[PDB]
């Protein structure tokens, strides 16, 4: 199995209290993070400058295809409380306007400040036969500074297999409803969330862990989803997307074992309303 991972790798310069720490993040990064525990992943990104360490982290989990560029695309990220951020673009790399021919299996999409125009979005429903979408990176401002969100019409996503917002983002989705996609991931961080399966709406509840930030949460959810829905039935695999993340977020490293993932995936809630 064969993934094509789209979006910047971002210098993520992380605010908690009075600490400050740089990493490695972006939807791109996260997503083939967890999509690199079931296949073979490539990240088509932009990046100008990074360090040689995490371009060895990225490496050592995909191969990347890099459209050149002159800057790094960086978020200031203000960790208020642990899913609670202020997000503020300090520099952006290059557009992704071009997508490569190959035996891509899956391709997602995750963009974090409008580098994928909806256009390419178009392209890939053609050039491929299954695509994921995160909307984050969709509904962003590509201005510099505080992320302001500008609502857009979703009829652009008919086709998609799997799409994921958050409860807050999926009020800028307009002309939208959940059966123009196979799967709708809404989640809302530690709070139960919604998934729809052809239209058919089910709650799930995440299992309760205490984070000081929830960065890549929602991408890891999307990528980890992505990779059991082709190995389990739906429920299962949203189960398991869940227990997932909720080791993600305490092992960022995502070295545990996959049957850890199972045990725990049993005890989240899911229901069909
Ligand atoms: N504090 C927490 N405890 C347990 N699970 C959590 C969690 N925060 C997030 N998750 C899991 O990750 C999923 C996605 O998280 P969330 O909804 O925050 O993504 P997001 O894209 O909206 C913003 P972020 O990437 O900063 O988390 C949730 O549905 C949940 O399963
Ligand atoms: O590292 C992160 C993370 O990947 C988020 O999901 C994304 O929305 C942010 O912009 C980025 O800074
Ligand atoms: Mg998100």
Same mark, same amino acid.
Request: contains cysteine.
């Given at each position: 199995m064969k993934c094509l991972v789209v979006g910047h790798v971002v210098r993520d310069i992380v605010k908690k209290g009075?600490?400050?720490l740089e990493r490695l993040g972006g939807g791109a990064y996260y997503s083939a993070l967890a999509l690199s525990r079931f296949c073979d992943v490539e990240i088509l990104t932009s990046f100008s400058n990074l360090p040689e360490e995490w371009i060895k982290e990225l490496e050592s989990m995909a191969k990347l295809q890099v459209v050149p560029s002159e800057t790094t695309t960086t978020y200031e990220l203000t960790y208020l409380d642990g899913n609670r951020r202020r997000?503020?673009? +300090? @520099? =952006?790399?290059?557009?992704? &306007? &071009?997508?490569?021919? /190959? &035996? $891509?299996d899956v391709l997602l999409m995750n963009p974090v400040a409008r580098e994928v125009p909806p256009a390419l979005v178009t392209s890939a429903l053609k050039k491929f036969p299954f695509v994921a979408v995160d909307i984050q990176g969709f509904i962003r401002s590509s201005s510099p500074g505080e992320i302001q969100y500008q609502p857009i019409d979703g009829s652009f996503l008919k086709g998609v297999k799997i799409?994921?917002?958050? +409860? /807050?983002e999926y009020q800028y989705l307009q002309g939208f409803?959940?059966?123009?996609?196979?799967?709708?991931?809404? *989640?809302?961080?530690? &709070?139960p969330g919604k998934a729809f399966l052809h239209g058919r @709406? $089910?709650? #799930? @509840?995440?299992?309760?862990? /205490?984070?000081?930030?929830?960065?890549?949460?929602?991408?890891?959810?999307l990528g980890a989803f992505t990779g059991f $829905? *082709?190995?389990?039935? #739906?429920?299962?695999?949203?189960? =398991?997307?869940?227990?997932?993340?909720?080791?993600?977020?305490?092992? =960022?490293?995502?070295?545990?074992?996959?049957?850890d993932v199972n045990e725990l995936?049993?005890?989240?809630?899911?229901? =069909?309303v």
């Open positions: 009075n600490k400050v997000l503020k673009l +300090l @520099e =952006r790399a290059s557009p992704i &306007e &071009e997508l490569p021919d /190959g &035996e $891509y799409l994921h917002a958050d +409860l /807050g409803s959940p059966e123009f996609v196979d799967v709708l991931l809404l *989640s809302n961080g530690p &709070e @709406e $089910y709650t #799930f @509840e995440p299992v309760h862990v /205490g984070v000081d930030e929830s960065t890549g949460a929602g991408d890891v959810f $829905y *082709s190995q389990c039935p #739906f429920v299962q695999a949203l189960k =398991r997307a869940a227990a997932f993340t909720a080791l993600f977020l305490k092992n =960022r490293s995502v070295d545990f074992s996959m049957d995936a049993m005890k989240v809630e899911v229901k =069909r």
